[PDB]
Amino acid sequence: MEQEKVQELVSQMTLDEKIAQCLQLSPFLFKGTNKNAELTGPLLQEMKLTDAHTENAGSVLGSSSALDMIGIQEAYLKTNRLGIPLVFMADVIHGYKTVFPIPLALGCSFDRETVRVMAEVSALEATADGHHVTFSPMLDLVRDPRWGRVMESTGEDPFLNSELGKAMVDGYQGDASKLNENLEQMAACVKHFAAYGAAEAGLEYNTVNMSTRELYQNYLPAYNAAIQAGAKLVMTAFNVVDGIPATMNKWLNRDVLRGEMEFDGVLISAWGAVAEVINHGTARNPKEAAQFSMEAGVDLEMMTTCYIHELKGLIEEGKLSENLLDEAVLRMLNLKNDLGLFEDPYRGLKNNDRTKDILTDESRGKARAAGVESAVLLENKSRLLPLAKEAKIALVGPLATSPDILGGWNVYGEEKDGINVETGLREVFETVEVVSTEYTELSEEDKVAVKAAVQNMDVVVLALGEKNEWGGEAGSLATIRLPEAQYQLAKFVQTLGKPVVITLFNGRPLEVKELAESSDALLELWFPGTEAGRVTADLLSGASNPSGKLSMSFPQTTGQIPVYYNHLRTGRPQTPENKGERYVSHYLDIPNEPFYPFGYGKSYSEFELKTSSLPKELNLGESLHVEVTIKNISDIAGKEVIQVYLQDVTASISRPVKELKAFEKVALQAGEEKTVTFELTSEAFSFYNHQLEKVQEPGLHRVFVGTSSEDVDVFEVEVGGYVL
Amino acid sequence: MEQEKVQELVSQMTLDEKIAQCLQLSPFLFKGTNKNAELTGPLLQEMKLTDAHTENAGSVLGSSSALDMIGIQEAYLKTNRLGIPLVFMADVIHGYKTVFPIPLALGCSFDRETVRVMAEVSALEATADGHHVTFSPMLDLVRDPRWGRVMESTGEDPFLNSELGKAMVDGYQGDASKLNENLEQMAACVKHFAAYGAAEAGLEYNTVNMSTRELYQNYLPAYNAAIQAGAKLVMTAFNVVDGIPATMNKWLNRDVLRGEMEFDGVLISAWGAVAEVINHGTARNPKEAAQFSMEAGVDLEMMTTCYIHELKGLIEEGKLSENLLDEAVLRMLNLKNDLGLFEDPYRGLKNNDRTKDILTDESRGKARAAGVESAVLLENKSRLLPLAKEAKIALVGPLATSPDILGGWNVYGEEKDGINVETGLREVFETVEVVSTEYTELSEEDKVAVKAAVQNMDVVVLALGEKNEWGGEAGSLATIRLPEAQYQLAKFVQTLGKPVVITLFNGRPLEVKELAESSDALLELWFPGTEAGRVTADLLSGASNPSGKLSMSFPQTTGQIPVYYNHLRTGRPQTPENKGERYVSHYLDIPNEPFYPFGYGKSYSEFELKTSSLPKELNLGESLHVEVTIKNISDIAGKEVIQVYLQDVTASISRPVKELKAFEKVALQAGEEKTVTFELTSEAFSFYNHQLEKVQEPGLHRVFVGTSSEDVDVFEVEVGGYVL
Ligand SMILES: OC[C@H]1O[C@@H](OC[C@H]2O[C@H](O)[C@H](O)[C@@H](O)[C@@H]2O)[C@H](O)[C@@H](O)[C@@H]1O
Ligand SMILES: OC[C@H]1O[C@@H](O)[C@H](O)[C@@H](O)[C@@H]1O
């Protein structure tokens, strides 16, 4: 409907209707929910919610199904005075019912299209079940794998995260201005604004601190990218940003988000984060929490009652302008309007059961393909992999049969529909003997059984990993290791003298030196999702060729953290020259390098890259165009991820030794050759200076071209002269 | 001499003379040295230093003795045109030849007078050997035990570090305006400006990043307090501060140091830190390193050649003002003048041999007292300690006979003058049997010998520890554990069925949980210095009663770092009333609490504390007077550390749950009672807001009074009304 009628609606609302519009509740707080209705009475009572609140609430979070949505919207619209429908929002993080790999795994694909397709399918299914908005993408830069939420991020690189964040928004939303017409797409909500992944000691919800320059340089760029790509909502972070909880941080949300980033959509709090500013010690009570959060521009309070119980009195007493309330309501109404809810409050569902669009075979094939793009081959000594389909396999370990392969943040998918490693393996390999072990134990009985199976077969697929519950939100591990019984199992298996592949399932970087050294191959599957078993079986048989690269460094040990490729040089770098000398930047007990670096992964193919002649000089403002010719020189078809880095050798700020500025995943048949070309704009050479200005300075840059952050060729370009 | 004559000197020096005055060299680069003359040739060659440079250099660093000094000074004055004597600087960190406990142990004393006396004796002796300046105190806040240099700090608390810093300045310098007459006092040099102990991942020299607010709040106050108390010099830090190497950080050194802190003495570089700005990637070559460091106001280049090889070109080409050089040179001459060097270049030594003032018995007694103040009793089950003088002791481990107990940053002290554990114990205990073991090994033959000594004896003193080379500068450990052999030794000893006291020697917090569980008593001696085994024997026997408290938290495990008492609350604090809820700030695998908290230490005595009735309300700017009555209620004379903390419950910035604001160690005979009073000025209730203003806000504060950061009674004070 027309903008004018949207405006009119706001004019017509009472003050109480306006306040309620800024409240979001679980489905079972509303009349006509078809699930958990026994909870309704007591919680309404605990939260001191009346019908006058629930009949005017702005939004539903976490509806269980189309029929939950429909019953709630129907009952709600019966009693709503002006007919403003509810907006329904959900956590669709890496799939709805067809579960794709965890976002950290998606990061490892280095494949924009893989990520878009993931998001497209997620929206196809989520819309089919009544959801209008997804709390995705999560764009928090991560350097600390102790934090359970690394699984939701695409990793340690701001550029990769930006690029995949855009892909995700494009997949969920399609053309953002046609969300009223395209009812299989949904609104995206960027999260968590901002810097949440810098949680101190990887402890959930803990303190975040960094200089403002760093915040701009590395922590804000992906949120910005996704916002500039049309992301419709943004969500607050639980953490302080420089001393002030993000939810009430006016500078952060008014000056930066709404001001500099020109975001004009709904700002939703993370769960309870409006009330939680009290806990943080920056509000004395719910009245202050409400006032400060409204001041900061938060439109929608998620499952707490500060606004609902406090705004009226604040406005009447002149401590808050009703104008700020009107701006929030308008933002909420426009989102509803963008989603087409004023013409159709059931968003396509009403005469049209879309059950059939959920968990199709086509969709499953897409999740499988994503899993195969995303896995990372870390070790393959003497071409153990791929296995011949006649290979006789001992399949041992906690991940041999565990159905827990869908990943954390899997709110709607069901393990009943997943494919476990055994089932997947038996579809490919004729001879499989299985010995399941527990996640945290290794008994003498297990050892006996494991030895019998290994003696019978030719190769060992040792399937290890994490329960998903050991990560995700409030899954913080102080030590980034598997249960010790699993490292023991790997030691034991190695003594039986048969070749061993370790297939590892997990949500975070782990200490894997001991695994790499106890096995001949190591394949990192992360949590691939619904098709986990077949993803595993196709990579192992070579039906698919591993092509993933690490989007986050794998530390030598927990104590090395944070370790990350785009690090500063220091005043005393360790060189190949000065190595062994005491007075340089080093540890006494480990190397400086992570165990596996950013951009690293193996293939069953072999590849050859050559960069075309580059200019020696460039003007300021001028682009560098990089041409790379890549050949597959093997008999095996595969993909390689070409990566281009830039270094700023000397600057007014100490700059990282490398930064990713372009990448493209290239498919080549055996002997096939291609040429890809990259443009590094003058923005790629620029950075934030000590006055917070975004600047390009003349001087030397290095350009690195290759297939990891460490396997590269290096060129020099001197920028100076005049400005384009 | 009179200031005009000092200004006359600046006016008469040639440009080359002024440049060279800003250079500092090792002693053997000068004619007249009496040690290491074989290094002189090649190093002059490598550094391209001529006679014209060395005959006009400003300063000597690390003279080897009074003779080295006299020879160098005397030859230098023969040839120096205007008669400007050399200033001699050295690292006197926790003692000269009488070695006192490492500064981190001195933090655990909580005793300002111990710290002043340590500095006083250090100056007595160092001046006796011809040193004019010491590179102490080290005032870097530390929260990360991986970093080797925690040994040089007094710990994780700004207030403690501020107070002991002033004590140290006071002890080295006495009345600063009389350093020209008090020739047994010497100048102090605060280091390292600024924030060096925040090195990322505990790695030597690594990146530091925090917000400007946080820098002011926690990282700057100790440097500030030492400077306000009159510290004559300041030294730059190796690390970046918000992206810019401290050495060439104009804002830091001109605006904050010289501007806000009003510091008008000599700014000396860390070792090589001027040239190293090149490696940091913020200067392209020595000419730039020279220009930027001089712009930032560094007066004295430590052992690199940027200034001497480049300043003439920079001044001649007018890229740098000669006035900046004249003010550096005037600062250098003012220091020399302040030390009385223009009346007496030999600073009291020329016809006065002061060997007699070195390593006196009185000084050894002071070092022993300091050791027994600083040690921390961590466990003492069933009153194992103190031992009877007739207890039969098996003394086992790598620290049983080891002479390495002087500590890191011991540049002049000698192991042969130190007292080891065995020697200390045999002065007190009639029956000791000793089995020495290696630091990193546990052999079968060791176990047999340990078993034999233990079977014979009644109790075991298990002496474990680090070698001092495993910390100090560029002694970073990713895992903060002893060698595994030592844990294995503790495990083994425990099986022998005799009571065990572990005496631990070390330069950092370590993972001691396994040691606490493997023994009946655990005594943290850190490294006590010259009197190490007498410190150890007096504490174990009861002749002294342990009184030290941790000034740094002891983590559960490496992966809990950073963990510190003065932490923020977060939005989702774990409370005793949400035990076991998933969605709160916690780890899955360890407690949130450190294994041992700040302010913790046991005693052979028992004390009771009673806080006098406090006001319920206070005005802004008003002090709070806190009166505490303490009684020793046991039969054993002993000392306790009364600690007062403050919390700002609600603020415009999220404030720590507690901060220490007063402390006093109280000595009490059996049954004796004392009252002490503390004034918490309004400065104690103030903080840096998001605008970087030092503010006091009206509102609620809590006052905690007790004997650790966790053993406290709590009171409430509402601040407001009018101001003063
Ligand atoms: O850390 C041991 C593992 O190292 C992998 O190589 C990764 C990366 O290491 C350096 O940066 C090299 O310069 C670069 O060429 C490498 O790609 C090995 O491939 C693993 O087998 C090792 O386990
Ligand atoms: O209680 C707070 C927490 O509640 C849970 O029910 C939600 O899923 C969490 O994501 C939320 O952060």
Ligand SMILES: OC[C@H]1O[C@@H](O)[C@H](O)[C@@H](O)[C@@H]1O
């Ligand atoms: O090479 C540089 C290093 O050499 C040693 O002689 C110094 O005492 C160190 O503190 C210095 O940082």
Ligand SMILES: OC[C@H]1O[C@@H](O)[C@H](O)[C@@H](O)[C@@H]1O
């Ligand atoms: O953290 C565990 C420790 O807590 C301390 O406060 C106790 O004094 C110790 O005996 C105990 O080992």
Ligand SMILES: OC[C@H]1O[C@H](O)[C@H](O)[C@@H](O)[C@@H]1O
């Ligand atoms: O040895 C002189 C100085 O060398 C280095 O600059 C160290 O950082 C410093 O702590 C020491 O005082």
Ligand SMILES: [Mg+2]
């Ligand atoms: Mg540059």
Ligand SMILES: [Mg+2]
């Ligand atoms: Mg307050």
